[PDB]
Amino acid sequence: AELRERLLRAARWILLLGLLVLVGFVVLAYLERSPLIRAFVLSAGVVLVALFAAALAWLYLAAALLGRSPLLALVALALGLITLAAASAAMAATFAHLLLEAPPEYREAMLYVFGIAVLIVGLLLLGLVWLLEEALEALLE
Amino acid sequence: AELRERLLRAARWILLLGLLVLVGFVVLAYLERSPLIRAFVLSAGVVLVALFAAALAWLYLAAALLGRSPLLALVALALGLITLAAASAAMAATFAHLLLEAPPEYREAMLYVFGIAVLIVGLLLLGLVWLLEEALEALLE
Amino acid sequence: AELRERLLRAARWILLLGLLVLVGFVVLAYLERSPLIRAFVLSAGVVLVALFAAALAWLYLAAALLGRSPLLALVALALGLITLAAASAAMAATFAHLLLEAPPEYREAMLYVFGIAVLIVGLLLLGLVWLLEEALEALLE
Amino acid sequence: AELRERLLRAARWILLLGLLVLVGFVVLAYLERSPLIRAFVLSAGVVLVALFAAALAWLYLAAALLGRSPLLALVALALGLITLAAASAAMAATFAHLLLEAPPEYREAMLYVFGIAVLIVGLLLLGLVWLLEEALEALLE
Amino acid sequence: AELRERLLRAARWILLLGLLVLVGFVVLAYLERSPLIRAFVLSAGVVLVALFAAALAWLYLAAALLGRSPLLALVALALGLITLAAASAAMAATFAHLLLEAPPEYREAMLYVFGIAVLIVGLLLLGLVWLLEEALEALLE
Amino acid sequence: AELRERLLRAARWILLLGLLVLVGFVVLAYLERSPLIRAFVLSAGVVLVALFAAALAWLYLAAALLGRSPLLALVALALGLITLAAASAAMAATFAHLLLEAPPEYREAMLYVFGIAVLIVGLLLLGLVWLLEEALEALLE
Numbered sequence: 001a002e003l004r005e006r007l008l009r010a011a012r013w014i015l016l017l018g019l020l021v022l023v024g025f026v027v028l029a030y031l032e033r034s035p036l037i038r039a040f041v042l043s044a045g046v047v048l049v050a051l052f053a054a055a056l057a058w059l060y061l062a063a064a065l066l067g068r069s070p071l072l073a074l075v076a077l078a079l080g081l082i083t084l085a086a087a088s089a090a091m092a093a094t095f096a097h098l099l100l101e102a103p104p105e106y107r108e109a110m111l112y113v114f115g116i117a118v119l120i121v122g123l124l125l126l127g128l129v130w131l132l133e134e135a136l137e138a139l140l141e
Numbered sequence: 142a143e144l145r146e147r148l149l150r151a152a153r154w155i156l157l158l159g160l161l162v163l164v165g166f167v168v169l170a171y172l173e174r175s176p177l178i179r180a181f182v183l184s185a186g187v188v189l190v191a192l193f194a195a196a197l198a199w200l201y202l203a204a205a206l207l208g209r210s211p212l213l214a215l216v217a218l219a220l221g222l223i224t225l226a227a228a229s230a231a232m233a234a235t236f237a238h239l240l241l242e243a244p245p246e247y248r249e250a251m252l253y254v255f256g257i258a259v260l261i262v263g264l265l266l267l268g269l270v271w272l273l274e275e276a277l278e279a280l281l282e
Numbered sequence: 283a284e285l286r287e288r289l290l291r292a293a294r295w296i297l298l299l300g301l302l303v304l305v306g307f308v309v310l311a312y313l314e315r316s317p318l319i320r321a322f323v324l325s326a327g328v329v330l331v332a333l334f335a336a337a338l339a340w341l342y343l344a345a346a347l348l349g350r351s352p353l354l355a356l357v358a359l360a361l362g363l364i365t366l367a368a369a370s371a372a373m374a375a376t377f378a379h380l381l382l383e384a385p386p387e388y389r390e391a392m393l394y395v396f397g398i399a400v401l402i403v404g405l406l407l408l409g410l411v412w413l414l415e416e417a418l419e420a421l422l423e
Numbered sequence: 424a425e426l427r428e429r430l431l432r433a434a435r436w437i438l439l440l441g442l443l444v445l446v447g448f449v450v451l452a453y454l455e456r457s458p459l460i461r462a463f464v465l466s467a468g469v470v471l472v473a474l475f476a477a478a479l480a481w482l483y484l485a486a487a488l489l490g491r492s493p494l495l496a497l498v499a500l501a502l503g504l505i506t507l508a509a510a511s512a513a514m515a516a517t518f519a520h521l522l523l524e525a526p527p528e529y530r531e532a533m534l535y536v537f538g539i540a541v542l543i544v545g546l547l548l549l550g551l552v553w554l555l556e557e558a559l560e561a562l563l564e
Numbered sequence: 565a566e567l568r569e570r571l572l573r574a575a576r577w578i579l580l581l582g583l584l585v586l587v588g589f590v591v592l593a594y595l596e597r598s599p600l601i602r603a604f605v606l607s608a609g610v611v612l613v614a615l616f617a618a619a620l621a622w623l624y625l626a627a628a629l630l631g632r633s634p635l636l637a638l639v640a641l642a643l644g645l646i647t648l649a650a651a652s653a654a655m656a657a658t659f660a661h662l663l664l665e666a667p668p669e670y671r672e673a674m675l676y677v678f679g680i681a682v683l684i685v686g687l688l689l690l691g692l693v694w695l696l697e698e699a700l701e702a703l704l705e
Numbered sequence: 706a707e708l709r710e711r712l713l714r715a716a717r718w719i720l721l722l723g724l725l726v727l728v729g730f731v732v733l734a735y736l737e738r739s740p741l742i743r744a745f746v747l748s749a750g751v752v753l754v755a756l757f758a759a760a761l762a763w764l765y766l767a768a769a770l771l772g773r774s775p776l777l778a779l780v781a782l783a784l785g786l787i788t789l790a791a792a793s794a795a796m797a798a799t800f801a802h803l804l805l806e807a808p809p810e811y812r813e814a815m816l817y818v819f820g821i822a823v824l825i826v827g828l829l830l831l832g833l834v835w836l837l838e839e840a841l842e843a844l845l846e
Contacts, residue, residue, distance in 0.1 A: 191367035339505035480646035
């Protein structure tokens with residue numbers, strides 16, 4: 001019945017994980033000892049908060065659509081999946097570009113934060129497959 | 142009706158925060174004895190005026206939608222949220238590139254106005270999402 | 283009636299300012315001996331002419347939508363505002379990049395002409411807000 | 424009156440100007456052989472042929488919509504105007520970048536070809552205003 | 565009905581020329597003697613295969629729309645013309661950038677492959693112009 | 706009725722290849738000998754996981770739109786083909802840039818991986834083009 005309970009629980013946990021990415025990348029921006037690391041970290045912080053805002057947005061489009069046509073919600077989740085995956089890909093290319101131009105002493109710690117950013121927004125786009133599949137099996141039957 | 146009071150009270154304070162950013166980043170352009178920090182500052186000025194105006198545009202579409210279909214406003218505000226978050230990310234990414242390419246003496250003061258510009262254009266998203274989800278609450282409860 | 287008149291009187295002056303700011307950056311390009319300053323000045327000429335002409339296109343998109351209702355104009359004008367704001371901020375960001383990469387001896391002329399571009403931004407975006415305030419009042423107050 | 428055939432009877436001369444820009448820039452591609460100039464010339468060749476293809480595509484679309492109403496012609500033609508203006512401004516930006524990074528001996532002749540592409544832009548945008556505004560008169564009649 | 569007997573024969577030779585570009589550029593990738601020329605050639609390979617996939621998509625979108633009327637195909641083919649022209653112009657611009665960045669010893673054969681992409685572009689855009697005209701002369705004239 | 710079998714069989718193999726090619730690039734991300742190669746590896750990883758997810762999104766959009774007719778899938782899958790192919794082309798372009806700017810000592814392993822990314826999206830080029838061939842056969846041939 002209320003598929004929105006799953007989507008909104010996912011969304012508000014995604015918001016809190018976005019606010020933990022905020023506190024985590026801001027506390028790293030308070031801990032870290034290079035301005036080029038602080039720039040990449042805080043930038044990745046908001047480039048990832050934008051990814052949590054993307055999953056928020058896609059979960060709001062579904063939560064509005066499933067009140068009248070659930071197959072339009074599934075499609076909105078999928079259109080958001082590819083769009084948030086493009087945001088992952090563009091972020092990954094961007095961060096590969098800064099890893100090439102950045103000086104060696106700030107490549108090392110940055111490669112991990114590139115990694116963890118890529119882990120968060122990669123897990124997000126794959127999570128949308130799991131969120132829509134229960135609606136997929138319920139209209140592909 | 143009721144949601145428009147929140148939406149448009151938010152909007153015109155978002156406009157005057159656009160005017161305070163206009164005056165604050167212009168006054169920084171009158172104080173700052175660096176053409177490269179002046180370039181960063183006025184471009185952060187128009188990225189933030191464009192950000193406030195993105196909230197103005199999507200708040201005007203929400204308010205004009207609320208006279209006929211609140212679920213259209215909810216969805217339009219969500220489409221505006223992700224788009225404004227991408228605009229935040231694009232500045233926060235590109236200005237992390239300028240923080241690498243710039244000469245050292247204009248990295249230090251630039252890292253602060255990178256910060257304050259990112260705070261202003263990022264917190265704006267947390268505003269827009271807190272507004273739109275009242276329509277999610279209203280339709281589900 | 284009144285919306286198209288105000289849009290079209292705005293348009294005609296926006297078209298004359300398109301042609302005149304073009305003739306201004308062309309006659310500046312007749313004085314300015316540096317090829318890099320002429321490239322910047324005439325490219326500012328294009329991206330500003332394109333913004334003026336795009337405000338014409340957004341005023342014509344309103345005039346075409348007005349045959350359905352004023353609310354079709356209000357929304358399409360606002361979608362033109364945010365698109366113009368993005369195009370403006372991307373222009374200012376581009377110029378804030380060229381002002382770093384350009385040799386020091388040609389940074390001063392950039393510091394005015396990216397400035398006059400930012401003045402045309404500050405005018406153009408609020409120029410749509412001012413008629414959105416009217417269309418909001420007429421539809422929704 | 425003539426709109427469905429008129430647009431396409433400017434367009435076919437815009438196709439011949441597409442082919443005459445093609446032959447002019449391909450002849451220039453051996454009149455001025457130097458690799459970076461030939462690259463900029465043939466790039467301006469296809470970035471202008473893409474602009475003539477844009478006007479061709481806009482002039483096919485705007486006419487084809489006219490079976491519904493004149494509002495469909497004016498909206499599609501104008502959405503092509505702004506989109507062609509943006510594509511032209513992006514060209515003016517990227518050309519203004521190559522004009523910095525290219526070595527001096529290939530800046531001089533390139534500044535003119537940047538110029539003639541920018542003239543063809545300045546013609547095209549005012550052309551799209553002049554081809555449209557009969558259907559603008561149809562919305563004050 | 566009859567329009568697709570042209571359009572699908574065109575499409576399948578566009579697919580074979582996609583696979584034949586996918587043999588000539590793919591063979592060149594192990595027949596050439598520089599990794600930067602391999603990068604430019606095989607990347608031009610997919611940038612051109614994406615063009616044959618674009619013309620494939622535009623011809624499948626006609627064939628699907630044609631069950632309603634030819635006027636849907638004419639519009640989709642024109643929408644694909646300008647949209648493929650942008651992707652083509654972005655190719656020539658982008659690879660003119662790599663052709664500045666490349667050292668002189670790998671500019672020479674690279675200039676020619678930029679050339680052959682510009683030939684395939686010129687063919688493709690004049691292609692969609694010829695393909696819609698038999699619908700234009702019938703329904704539009 | 707039947708077509709969601711062919712779609713979701715292709716999809717689940719595309720998801721498994723998403724995770725397995727992800728495990729290929731994650732194993733490489735702790736067995737490759739340079740941070741720049743690991744950055745290219747992980748980015749080639751998520752730019753392919755995003756490509757696999759693009760095909761997942763197009764396969765969900767087909768299988769959901771199939772409740773109207775297979776012609777909605779043909780159109781959606783084709784709209785997905787062009788943008789997925791363009792995403793591989795933009796990857797191959799930006800990776801031709803990193804492969805030019807990176808020093809020789811990190812060009813060698815990178816010369817395979819840009820190729821293996823180019824090959825692997827060929828599964829998605831074919832995997833959509835084959836189902837476009839069947840969906841075109843199904844309408845009238």
